Design an enzyme around this catalytic site. Sequence first.
Site, PDB file in Angstrom:
ATOM      1  N   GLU A   1      -7.133   6.376  -8.718  1.00  0.00           N
ATOM      2  CA  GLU A   1      -6.811   7.032  -9.970  1.00  0.00           C
ATOM      3  C   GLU A   1      -8.001   7.048 -10.915  1.00  0.00           C
ATOM      4  O   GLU A   1      -7.910   7.632 -11.996  1.00  0.00           O
ATOM      5  CB  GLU A   1      -5.596   6.349 -10.607  1.00  0.00           C
TER       6      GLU A   1
ATOM      7  N   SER B   1      -8.398   8.613  -3.134  1.00  0.00           N
ATOM      8  CA  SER B   1      -7.065   8.099  -3.405  1.00  0.00           C
ATOM      9  C   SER B   1      -6.992   7.271  -4.674  1.00  0.00           C
ATOM     10  O   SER B   1      -5.890   6.891  -5.087  1.00  0.00           O
ATOM     11  CB  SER B   1      -6.581   7.242  -2.230  1.00  0.00           C
TER      12      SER B   1
ATOM     13  N   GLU C   1       0.861  -1.189   0.000  1.00  0.00           N
ATOM     14  CA  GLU C   1       0.000   0.000   0.000  1.00  0.00           C
ATOM     15  C   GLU C   1       0.895   1.237   0.000  1.00  0.00           C
ATOM     16  O   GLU C   1       1.328   1.688   1.068  1.00  0.00           O
ATOM     17  CB  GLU C   1      -0.951   0.011   1.191  1.00  0.00           C
TER      18      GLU C   1
HETATM   19 MG   LIG Z   1      -4.373   5.212  -5.574  1.00  0.00          MG
END
Ligand SMILES: [Mg+2]
EC number: 3.2.1.31
Length: 955
Positions: free
Chosen positions: A565, A563, A482
């Site tokens: 894309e 967070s 992560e």
């Molecule tokens: Mg991301």
Amino acid sequence: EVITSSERTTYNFNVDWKFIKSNPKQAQDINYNDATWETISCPHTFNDVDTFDDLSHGHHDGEDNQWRGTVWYRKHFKLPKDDKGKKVFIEFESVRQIADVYINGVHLGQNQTGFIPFGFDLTPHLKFGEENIIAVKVNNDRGDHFRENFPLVWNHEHWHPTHGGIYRNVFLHTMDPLHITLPLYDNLETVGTYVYAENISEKSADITVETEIQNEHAENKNITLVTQIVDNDGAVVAHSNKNVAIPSGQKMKVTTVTNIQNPQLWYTRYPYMYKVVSAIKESNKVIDTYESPLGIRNFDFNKDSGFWINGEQIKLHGWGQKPTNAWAGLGAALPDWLRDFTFKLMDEAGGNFIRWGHCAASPAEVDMGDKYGFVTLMPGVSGESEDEGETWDIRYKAFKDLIVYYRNHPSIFIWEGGNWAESEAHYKEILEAIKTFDPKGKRLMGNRRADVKNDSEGYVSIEIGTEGWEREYPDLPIIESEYNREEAPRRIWDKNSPDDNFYNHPNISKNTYKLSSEEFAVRQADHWWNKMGKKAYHSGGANWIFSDGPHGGRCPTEVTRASGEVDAVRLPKEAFYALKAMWRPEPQVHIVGHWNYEVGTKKTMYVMSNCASVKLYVNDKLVGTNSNPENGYVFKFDNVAWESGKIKAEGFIDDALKTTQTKETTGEPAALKLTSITGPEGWLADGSDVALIDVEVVDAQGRRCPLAKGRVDFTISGPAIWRGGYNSGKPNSTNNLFLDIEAGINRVAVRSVLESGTVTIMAKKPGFKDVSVTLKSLPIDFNNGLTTTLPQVYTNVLTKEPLPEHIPEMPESELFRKFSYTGDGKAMLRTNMHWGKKAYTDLEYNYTVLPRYLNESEYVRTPNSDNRYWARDQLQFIAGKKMHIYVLHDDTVPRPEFLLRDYEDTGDNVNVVGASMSVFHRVAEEGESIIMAGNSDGDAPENCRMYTVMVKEFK
Ligand SMILES: [Mg+2]
Ligand SMILES: [Br-]
């Protein structure tokens, strides 16, 4: 030659259920009147109408303003009186969170995993030739506090939005009493088939299949087991037979070994999929068939050179995605083809790796890993904790169920043992489960944050890293689980574009991240290159979050953790095209942003590219050449003068033109544009299939206006259910028959009903002509509650991709054991504390007066910029010796929970340039796990001080 038909029938059990969002008495009874309940179809969640509509809390607290409690499903169905002597099983892919299943009023049992398949034998309670009734009582409650939520500690919106209900598929399996067993360990205690490949080369491979067979007839059966290897064209390439007797009532495993000549191996760039057909024959009569996936591959996670597959080394780059995987307007209940749509997007942007965070993916999503070539790090159920007691028992049992279900998929390469370090005894149990149910897969095992307990050494097989920190197990390969915690909304292009409810959002000052899409995109290379890309020993890993979701975040301007894309409706951000330009193997360039700026604008232009050099043109005038990319992929061009027209970047490898992108200034807005997207079989009238609709604002040339915004109103007619979309920056934007355009586009979903027909959606916006799309929901083969048509997914997706033509050039404390810091700023370990030493890494403030015991201590220079940051694993280390731990905490900051739990107040203070920091004291034994979280649990003063840590050996 391929064995197709047998006594086995697999029914889709999703279509036509009754549902109620309450807990009526005796709701499981045969003769309960459910006529007033709601007609739905699975996948289904009752939290589709009340999620993505609350602005984020921040502090990694997920959306909690949603309905939670006990609900009921009931389904009517009739099997042919023909099937009167058949076994009947029901399979649930997942139910969130606690499911209790009943057949004709008889309780079959419960499953509390929330994310792992399970099933039951209905046969003893079935009335053949009559209507039967399945009832499912479901509960999605959870304790408020994520640290006080036992036993199902993974069940919390902190990591997993608590979208309740039957949010994945349901199947009915009917088969002969003599049958291959189903891999539903809960609660059938059976394992089905086990497929593994040995002695693999381009020339040859040996496939071992252990087929568990059960004879539920009252007489012994003499059978022939047939193992068929079937290639991508449906041809039988090889087969094996064994003649065995199954005594009445017995289970046994039958083993075959089948050689494949010149096997097509499974690559990330060519995920060739075989299938194994297992058949039970009774002399030329086929009794049962079962199909198992097969991908043949050698691999090595190497401690020195990263990941290899079939002799080729491959940099792994992909995403960590929440199993809830929720879609705004639909919650977590994605139809399989929307899961496929999500996955095709990861594939489009060059992904070859996926980690599910932090519970298992759906079954079809593991099929998608198989067919798109994604190396997969797979957990069972987990939150973020070393677990014990009943929490561990349920989680460990889920882990066994998980391996039994998924062990045959080639996309799985690592069993995630947990999202936190575990005890030595629990590591033993994890390896024992893999040895029991997957002794031959050659998969590795690791836990994230294994580095916070000395127990992990000698048990984990691969380092599961966090945020690209230095390796703590150099004996082992490493994979990132992560990285990149940043957030940025789709609707904000850059600081040269007009704001869209962000820089002036009422909540903007509560955001940890105040990044535009351009900053968020460009920094994708910063994060990737410095944490994985430039490290030849690093296998790669997972970008945190692919699609925005309402799990815990740090930006109260958005209704999600922004967070991803792509956003919660899978509209891509510029950061999606940044990663795509970096990670795809073919030459790429992507110009970040658009070309609609004001006259006289000068701005830095960013081209993301996997090429060696990039040329930039404004209306065909060359404005620059860059052969020195930053962080491997950023070709920036400063002070570019905007000119209305066209901006074009050219990508070069060895000074040869490889690829070109052009972006154009759009004209004035002129029309609305509606585009429909349906599944590969069309929009099916099954009560749950979804049609997507892109609503766009276009100029007279049909190009999307990148600056367009404002409210569009919709009308719908025909047999359908409107499900709207969302606006990330606005509460209560879901469900409504209206929605704001963002950067020229938004996307809404329309769900079908059982009635097929024609459906018309009209869009309106002041100043534009009305526009409409017409959809047709198609009828499905449906009868007596059942259909043999499985959920639609994309088929025949196999293509070959080349290796990259260019890869950027790559470069050449006894107490703070395994220290790491995961805030946005930088920490620094330092020794010899006394008057005059700097307290922070990003300030020049020094320590002056100190209580006597603080001098000569080791200390962590923290970044003051993280003064209102929160992470569960913000600051950690293992106590190297028995030692004193001092935490200096700003008196103006509410004391966080970790401080009050394990630290006492000294009474003394340490003043650092006007700020009074109370010392908190803790004595730790050697090897104690020291975990520190955010400076405050919730809100705090904007100008407060980040805490500091000091450590001295006990002596
Ligand atoms: Mg991301
Ligand atoms: Br989610």
